[PDB]
Design a protein around this ligand. Structure first.
Ligand SMILES: O=[N+]([O-])c1cc(-n2ccnn2)ccc1NCCCCCCN[C@H]1C[C@](O)(CO)[C@@H](O)[C@H](O)[C@H]1O
Ligand SMILES: *[C@@H]1O[C@H](CO)[C@@H](O)[C@H](O)[C@H]1NC(C)=O
Length: 765
């Protein structure tokens, strides 16, 4: 039955708008296949189009906003784009129609509305770009009757092994088509939909913009050569209308020009399914998808007081739809340094200088190809997989569709190498690389990241203990299916755990360090004087100078998180020898957190170093790091230490701002210094962990129950209201929030773990 659910899930998830790096485009979960993309831009002059045309996601003053209003990867959804520069509001509706043997069919509606400020006779160029990678695949544009282009629909017929036979149709559409009285029309027509069918080497097919512009440039070259000059120039829009030349090839450009409002459809018909998809099919299924989305949202994300209002519901729908709408399929090679240079061991004082020398050897090479199915922090700024981010992304998604989330977790673990390493940033293929400076592409096998995907697994296990709709919860509804999933994944989880202890081990034995265990101590590799990027808390102040005898309390707490998970999963699988080993490790971490990390003088947890005199020293900077054992759920609900942490969390003069918990204390000497990234701002992922642990203490009998209940109530309200207030004013979720002004700052479109706010509102953890 597991194999059967596997196949059904594959078929359900195959097609999507799985290119979150562009405003709108589709690809299936197949490395080398058919991809589609949308471009538009106003044309007012002979030179402006190259500046106006939209393709890849950005966020600047020329773009008011964009995002998914509704989305489910099984059914599709509706996206809204508000383009100031091009004076357009665009809607892209996408819908999936199951059937046949090849992952089903789909359709899209592209609707453009001129905004109030736009000239009522604006000319807009719109391009639908289609490409196909494959050795034995074919794609052919059926030619038009008319001399110069299409009066009606453009039909592409194609075949691949993965897709079988299919037809893709770009409809004539509704909206005024501008007409030219110029002489050029004798040779190019007066104005009509055109198609160029081209071939290029497979690996450059993703470069849609440069490919389009090269065609446009050859068009203009033709004009000059054929004596169309500045004495009497054709209109700008006609200068930029490609000459019709349809045919076979691995690239097809479908170009339309519109004056005023426009709309057109894209219909993809899997031949192996029933009758071909129609426009009428599209509208019906769109209506149906919205109805289904609304129902699931009210079940899954029941927003509790004081966020029951329609304003908060809209806010929740938007935050959630953008998070789930960010899911992408990525494929290609990665840049990895596989030297394992000895300087990367970081065993000596000054190690950061030795490590940089080794990096400057530039031994990294491309490897793979790999594929990844994942959500992403930010369409415009971070459109790729981040390891510890995904743990947070999947918490809301798992509520929506555990089978989806499990699929994504599986995607991630399928990347793990023989050592147990998964690269913390997944840049797959030349397309993904185009968005990343080369210096920052290289992944290092010694660099870890928080193993937050364990948290999602914890949620899955608890649920397991306690037709799309059916598929979405198949893995919990059929307990044998869930366990089979865990059976396969469990060895990879154990491998990663072992990798942590081999590669991120700290040094107890070689110093004057008394502690309950000689094994349990941990140190993030990859730290510079000012940074520890691998920890995820980029610039949070750590011991100075960096030192091989450092110990990091957050890393140890994550190791705690992992063992707990392996205890739960091992028990389920009856790995008795395993559970006994983990149990001892959990015991050891609990004592060693106290022995090496607890500061009585300061009343919180702390990183450690080794002195100028070779003595163990705590270095305390009060902030998220100080709370880590609490945030990770390692503290007993009656613990005196917990009490002290609750005092720190609730202290206004330290961590507690009107807008949420500051990442660093106002009293810390590093507050608001340097890049001030993790040195004061409020971060929703860490606030989310606090809220969940506060709630936990609040809903059990114990001495801190009422303290936690008060803090839970207020922190939930503070965090939700902060994100909502900014969403209301700016239309954006932000990477972080200013604790003095409440203002969102840094990266826009951070959906992104900011979207956890949907889970915070719906409560009842
Ligand atoms: O380095 N580049 O890619 C880069 C590319 C371009 N650029 C623009 C156009 N083309 N290229 C410009 C600049 C940079 N430098 C920035 C590198 C520092 C890494 C950011 C800090 N990480 C944040 C966010 C997460 O990393 C992901 O949400 C969290 O995981 C983490 O916890 C969190 O602190
Ligand atoms: C799901 O995607 C395709 C469709 O069959 C296949 O190549 C892939 O391996 C499937 N997953 C597994 C592990 O079978």
């Amino acid at each position: 039955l597991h194999s059967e659910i596997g196949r059904l899930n594959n078929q359900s998830l195959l097609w999507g708008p799985y290119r979150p790096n562009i405003y709108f485009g589709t690809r299936p979960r197949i490395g080398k296949s058919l991809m589609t993309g949308l471009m538009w831009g106003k044309i007012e002059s002979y030179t402006d189009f190259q500046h106006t045309v939209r393709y890849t996601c950005e966020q600047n003053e020329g773009m008011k906003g964009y995002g998914w209003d509704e989305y489910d990867p099984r059914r599709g959804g509706i996206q809204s784009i508000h383009d100031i520069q091009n004076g357009l509001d665009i809607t892209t509706s996408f819908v999936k129609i199951p059937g046949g043997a090849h992952g089903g069919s789909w359709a899209a509606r592209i609707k453009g509305t001129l905004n109030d400020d736009a000239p009522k006779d604006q000319k807009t160029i719109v391009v639908f770009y289609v490409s196909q990678e494959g050795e034995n695949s074919e794609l052919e544009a059926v030619p038009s009757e008319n001399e110069f282009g299409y009066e009606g629909d453009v039909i592409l017929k194609g075949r691949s092994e993965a897709l079988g036979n299919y037809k893709l149709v770009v409809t004539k559409g509704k909206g005024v088509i501008p007409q030219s009285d110029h002489d050029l029309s004798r040779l190019r027509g007066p104005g009509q939909t055109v198609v160029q069918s081209l071939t290029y080497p497979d690996e450059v097919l993703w470069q849609a913009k440069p490919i389009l512009f090269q065609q446009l440039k050859a068009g203009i070259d033709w004009l000059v050569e054929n004596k169309y000059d500045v004495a009497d120039p054709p209109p700008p829009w006609q200068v930029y209308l490609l000459a019709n030349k349809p045919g076979s090839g691995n690239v097809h450009i479908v170009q339309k020009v519109f004056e005023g409002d426009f709309e057109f459809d894209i219909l993809f018909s899997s031949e192996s399914a029933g009758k071909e998809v129609t426009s009428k099919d599209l509208e019906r299924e769109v209506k149906q998808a919205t109805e289904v989305f609304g129902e699931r949202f009210a079940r899954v994300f029941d927003l509790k007081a004081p966020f029951q209002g329609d304003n908060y519901k809209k806010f929740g729908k938007s935050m959630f739809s953008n998070l789930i709408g960010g899911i992408g399929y990525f494929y290609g090679h990665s840049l990895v340094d596989r030297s394992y240079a000895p300087e990367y061991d970081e065993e000596n004082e000054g190690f950061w200088e030795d490590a940089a020398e080794a990096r400057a050897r530039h031994q990294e090479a491309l490897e793979g190809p790999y594929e990844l199915f994942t959500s992403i922090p930010s369409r415009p700024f971070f459109p790729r997989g981040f390891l510890w981010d995904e743990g947070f992304h999947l918490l809301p998604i798992a509520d929506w569709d555990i089978d989806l989330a499990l699929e994504i977790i599986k995607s991630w673990y399928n990347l793990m190498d023989e050592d147990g390493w998964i690269a913390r940033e997944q840049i797959l293929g030349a397309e993904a690389r185009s968005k990343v400076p080369k210096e920052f592409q290289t992944q290092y096998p010694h660099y870890a990241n928080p193993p937050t995907l364990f948290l999602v697994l914890d949620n899955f296990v608890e649920r397991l203990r306690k037709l799309d709709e059916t598929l979405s919860t198949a893995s919990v509804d059929n307990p044998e299916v869930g366990l089979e999933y865990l059976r396969r994944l469990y060895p990879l989880l154990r491998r990663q755990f072992d990798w942590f202890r081999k590669t991120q081990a700290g040094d107890i034995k070689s110093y004057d360090r008394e502690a309950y265990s000689t094994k349990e101590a941990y140190r993030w590799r990859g730290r510079t004087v000012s940074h520890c990027l691998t920890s995820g808390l980029d610039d949070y102040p750590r011991p100075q100078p960096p030192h091989p005898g450092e110990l990091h309390v957050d890393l140890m707490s994550w190791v705690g998180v992992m063992v707990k998970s392996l205890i739960s999963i091992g028990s389920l699988l009856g790995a008795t020898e395993d559970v006994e080993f983990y149990t001892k490790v959990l015991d050891a971490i609990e004592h060693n957190l106290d022995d090496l990390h607890w500061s009585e003088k300061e009343g919180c947890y702390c990183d450690a170093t080794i002195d100028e005199f070779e003595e163990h020293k705590l270095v305390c900077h009060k902030g998220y790091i100080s709370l880590f054992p609490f945030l990770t759920g390692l503290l007993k609900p009656d613990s005196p230490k917990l009490g002290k942490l609750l005092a720190l969390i609730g202290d206004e003069s330290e961590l507690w701002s009107p807008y949420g918990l500051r990442s660093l204390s106002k009293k810390d000497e590093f507050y608001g210094t340097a890049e001030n990234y993790w040195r004061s701002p409020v971060w929703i992922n860490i606030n989310y962990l606090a809220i969940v642990q506060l709630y936990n203490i609040a809903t059990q009998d114990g001495p801190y129950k009422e303290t936690a209940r008060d803090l839970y109530t207020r922190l939930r309200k503070n965090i939700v209201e902060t994100v909502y207030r900014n969403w209301e004013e700016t239309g954006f979720a932000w990477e972080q929030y200013n604790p003095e002004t409440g203002k969102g700052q840094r990266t826009q479109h951070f959906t992104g773990w900011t979207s956890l706010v949907v889970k915070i509102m719906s409560g009842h953890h």
